[PDB]
Amino acid sequence: HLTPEEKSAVTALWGKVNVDEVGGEALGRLLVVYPWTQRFFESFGDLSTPDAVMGNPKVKAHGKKVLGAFSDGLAHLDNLKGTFATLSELHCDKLHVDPENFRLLGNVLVCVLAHHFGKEFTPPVQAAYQKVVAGVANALAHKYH
Amino acid sequence: HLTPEEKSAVTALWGKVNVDEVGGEALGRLLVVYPWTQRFFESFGDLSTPDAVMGNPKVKAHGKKVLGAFSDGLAHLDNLKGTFATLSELHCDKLHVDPENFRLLGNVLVCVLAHHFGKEFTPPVQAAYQKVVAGVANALAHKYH
Amino acid sequence: VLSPADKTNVKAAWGKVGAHAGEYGAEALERMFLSFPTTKTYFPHFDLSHGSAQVKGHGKKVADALTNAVAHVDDMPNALSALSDLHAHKLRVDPVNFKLLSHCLLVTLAAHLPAEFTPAVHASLDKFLASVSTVLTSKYR
Amino acid sequence: VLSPADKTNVKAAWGKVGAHAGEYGAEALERMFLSFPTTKTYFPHFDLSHGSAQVKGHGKKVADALTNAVAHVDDMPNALSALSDLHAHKLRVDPVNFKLLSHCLLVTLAAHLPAEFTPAVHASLDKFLASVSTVLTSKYR
Ligand code: HEM
Numbered sequence: 001h002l003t004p005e006e007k008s009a010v011t012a013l014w015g016k017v018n019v020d021e022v023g024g025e026a027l028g029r030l031l032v033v034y035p036w037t038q039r040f041f042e043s044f045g046d047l048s049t050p051d052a053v054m055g056n057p058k059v060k061a062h063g064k065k066v067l068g069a070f071s072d073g074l075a076h077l078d079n080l081k082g083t084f085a086t087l088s089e090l091h092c093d094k095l096h097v098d099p100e101n102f103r104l105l106g107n108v109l110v111c112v113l114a115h116h117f118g119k120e121f122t123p124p125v126q127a128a129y130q131k132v133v134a135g136v137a138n139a140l141a142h143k144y145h
Numbered sequence: 146h147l148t149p150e151e152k153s154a155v156t157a158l159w160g161k162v163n164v165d166e167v168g169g170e171a172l173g174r175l176l177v178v179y180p181w182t183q184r185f186f187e188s189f190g191d192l193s194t195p196d197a198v199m200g201n202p203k204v205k206a207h208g209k210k211v212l213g214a215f216s217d218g219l220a221h222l223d224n225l226k227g228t229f230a231t232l233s234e235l236h237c238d239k240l241h242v243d244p245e246n247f248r249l250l251g252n253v254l255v256c257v258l259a260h261h262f263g264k265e266f267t268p269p270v271q272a273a274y275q276k277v278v279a280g281v282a283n284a285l286a287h288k289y290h
Numbered sequence: 291v292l293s294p295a296d297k298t299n300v301k302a303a304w305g306k307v308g309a310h311a312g313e314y315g316a317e318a319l320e321r322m323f324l325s326f327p328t329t330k331t332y333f334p335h336f337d338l339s340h341g342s343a344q345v346k347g348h349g350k351k352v353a354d355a356l357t358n359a360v361a362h363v364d365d366m367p368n369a370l371s372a373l374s375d376l377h378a379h380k381l382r383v384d385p386v387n388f389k390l391l392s393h394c395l396l397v398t399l400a401a402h403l404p405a406e407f408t409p410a411v412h413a414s415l416d417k418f419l420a421s422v423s424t425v426l427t428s429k430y431r
Numbered sequence: 432v433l434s435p436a437d438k439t440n441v442k443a444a445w446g447k448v449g450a451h452a453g454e455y456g457a458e459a460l461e462r463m464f465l466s467f468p469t470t471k472t473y474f475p476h477f478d479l480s481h482g483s484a485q486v487k488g489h490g491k492k493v494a495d496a497l498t499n500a501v502a503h504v505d506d507m508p509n510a511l512s513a514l515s516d517l518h519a520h521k522l523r524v525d526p527v528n529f530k531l532l533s534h535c536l537l538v539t540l541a542a543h544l545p546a547e548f549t550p551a552v553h554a555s556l557d558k559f560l561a562s563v564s565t566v567l568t569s570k571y572r
């Protein structure tokens with residue numbers, strides 16, 4: 001439950017995001033900062049150094065898709081379950097991804113938004129985005145069993 | 146959400162629980178195993194050894210009170226939020242208790258049930274009680290602000 | 291850190307487990323999979339049903355590793371070196387899951403040790419399992 | 432453990448903070464109180480309004496403590512002894528909250544250090560904050 005002030009803040013900032021670029025950056029930093037998450041990405045090739053991770057074309061390409069789904073979620077803050085139901089099933093049944101990883105990615109995304117926007121990423125705007133990333137994580141986890 | 150088999154398992158086991166005794170045991174064990182939780186009970190006297198904590202009349206009395214409220218909530222598993230809303234607001238506004246404490250206590254209670262009931266506390270019965278204690282903790286946390 | 295009393299407590303409780311070690315490891319695993327279904331994501335190659343050979347076999351491995359940690363309680367980082375390598379570099383289990391299994395191991399011990407699982411021993415076992423978990427995640431990054 | 436590379440990265444990044452100690456500490460605290468309101472349960476005695484002098488003063492103490500920890504990366508347990516005692520035995524802040532404040536410190540650094548906050552440095556800073564948090568909770572039980 002974002003307040004109406006929070007909802008408008010999230011939307012405002014997100015319009016300034018290059019979703020493609022930011023997606024690759026967040027996924028790349030996830031793999032660098034928490035290197036055990038590389039377990040799911042053996043098909044992505046070279047992830048052996050920070051430079052290799054950040055420069056990897058598959059990381060950039062996948063980051064685009066991931067943050068695209070995130071972006072679409074922002075239009076349904078009241079119904080995140082509908083947006084992520086199919087992806088939740090995929091991440092559970094096909095990909096076997098521990099949903100604890102979704103929290104890590106959300107916090108990395110918050111760090112990337114802070115890095116990108118600087119002072120514009122104010123403490124209230126961050127609080128709004130923390131509610132968003134927790135909501136996305138919870139929705140992505142909801143079909144696990 | 147507890148399934149019907151889970152609800153039946155919770156009710157059946159709880160029928161055998163001496164709530165006063167189990168409450169004192171669970172609160173005592175919380176204070177022994179996670180000593181920082183003693184922070185709320187400086188008026189209780191000496192809590193510096195397991196035996197002192199466990200035999201402390203104020204620990205026993207408070208455990209009785211806490212688990213009494215928990216017990217009443219088991220009659221309302223489909224509305225834990227409403228049931229615990231007033232206590233949630235109290236624990237936040239007057240008592241300043243970090244909700245992490247409710248989660249620690251919940252797992253201590255599961256240990257105490259396992260210890261008291263042994264084999265009867267089967268893996269499925271545990272899973273049901275894990276849903277209950279998480280639900281109570283989430284309900285107690287819900288009015289925090 | 292584990293006090294002399296902790297080490298004494300752990301050695302006594304784990305000593306009573308004895309030949310039931312494998313059984314209790316499998317039971318703790320089952321408890322974990324049922325109570326915390328996300329932990330199953332680490333075992334897609336397992337048949338996770340009650341009684342399964344893979345769960346029994348893995349339960350014995352976990353328990354035996356714990357027995358080894360107890361046998362070398364003063365130097366667990368060395369005693370568990372190969373295992374911490376394996377979890378950090380290969381298995382790559384998110385650290386929160388160690389808390390889940392640790393709790394399920396405690397519950398299992400509680401359910402099998404009516405006499406030994408005193409408040410003091412409960413406290414010491416929990417410290418021990420958190421210590422093992424810390425060692426097992428010590429090489430993650 | 433912090434590698435030589437981690438220590439270099441932390442010292443480089445934290446060196447950039449400099450005279451901004453009170454400011455960045457107070458900002459990280461505000462980020463924490465707003466993002467994770469349960470952390471306010473440890474400060475019922477504080478005026479937590481925006482720009483409150485009390486939060487500013489406390490932010491300075493937290494930041495100065497971190498500056499000291501950076502200076503003492505090779506002997507952090509000894510260097511942080513008083514603070515580890517204080518958090519373990521008086522304040523008794525639940526360990527989960529250190530992860531919340533660490534994240535908010537990291538976000539604050541990201542928001543202020545555009546040039547310095549590379550993926551490698553982000554990784555080193557996160558390791559450092561976890562190590563500080565480990566030391567500060569090392570006496571809890
Ligand atoms: C929490 C936010 C996340 C969202 C919105 C998200 C979304 C997506 C999307 C849209 C796809 C492509 C699916 C398709 O094309 O059918 C995907 C695939 C995938 N995701 Fe996620 N994801 C998230 C987090 C994670 C994290 C944290 C992990 C593990 C660290 C992960 C692991 C994977 C893997 C391994 C694939 C398949 C990649 C491949 O094709 O090899 N995801 N995800």
Ligand code: HEM
Nearest residue numbers: 182185186210211212214215232240242246247250281285
């Ligand atoms: C199942 C979880 C819990 C429930 C249902 C519960 C319930 C209660 C109830 C019914 C009261 C009396 C409130 C009144 O005066 O109207 C109370 C008071 C209190 N609780 Fe909780 N409690 C729980 C967990 C905890 C935990 C884990 C702690 C801290 C470790 C805690 C700390 C306190 C304190 C400090 C008081 C005030 C005691 C006094 O005034 O003597 N509670 N609680």
Ligand code: HEM
Nearest residue numbers: 329332333348351352355356381383387388391422423426
């Ligand atoms: C008390 C903590 C734990 C200990 C002592 C432990 C010990 C072990 C041992 C002894 C092995 C066999 C190693 C070998 O083959 O050389 C193993 C493998 C494994 N562990 Fe850990 N473990 C612990 C916690 C966990 C956690 C929490 C998880 C994730 C939920 C996990 C997931 C795995 C997996 C997936 C394997 C490989 C299983 C297989 O393919 O047969 N372990 N562990």
Ligand code: HEM
Nearest residue numbers: 470473474489492493496497514522524528529532563564
């Ligand atoms: C980076 C981790 C942290 C560091 C370096 C740190 C450092 C400090 C310092 C330097 C003080 C002042 C001690 C004095 O008066 O001499 C302090 C006090 C305090 N800390 Fe921590 N702290 C950390 C995390 C936390 C967390 C996570 C919490 C709980 C959310 C917390 C709660 C408190 C409280 C309530 C006080 C007393 C404030 C007062 O009454 O003035 N701290 N801390």
Ligand SMILES: CC(C)(Oc1ccc(NC(=O)Nc2cc(Cl)cc(Cl)c2)cc1)C(=O)O
Nearest residue numbers: 103134245248249250251252253279467527
């Ligand atoms: C939004 C935020 C900060 O929320 C949270 C972060 C941590 C926790 N703590 C836990 O779950 N403790 C916990 C403790 C026990 Cl003993 C048992 C169980 Cl089952 C859980 C709760 C909520 C997050 O998810 O990042």
Ligand SMILES: CC(C)(Oc1ccc(NC(=O)Nc2cc(Cl)cc(Cl)c2)cc1)C(=O)O
Nearest residue numbers: 252386389390393420526527568569571572
């Ligand atoms: C500093 C110190 C002593 O703190 C602590 C040590 C252990 C615990 N217990 C837990 O969190 N249990 C726990 C159990 C489950 Cl099922 C889920 C989750 Cl999410 C958590 C809490 C704090 C340490 O880390 O050693």
Ligand SMILES: CC(C)(Oc1ccc(NC(=O)Nc2cc(Cl)cc(Cl)c2)cc1)C(=O)O
Nearest residue numbers: 107385427428430431527530531534535561
């Ligand atoms: C073994 C190793 C490297 O694992 C880890 C180290 C750090 C993290 N990050 C977090 O949990 N952040 C985190 C951040 C928030 Cl806001 C809330 C919560 Cl609940 C957690 C996760 C695992 C370690 O413990 O040192």
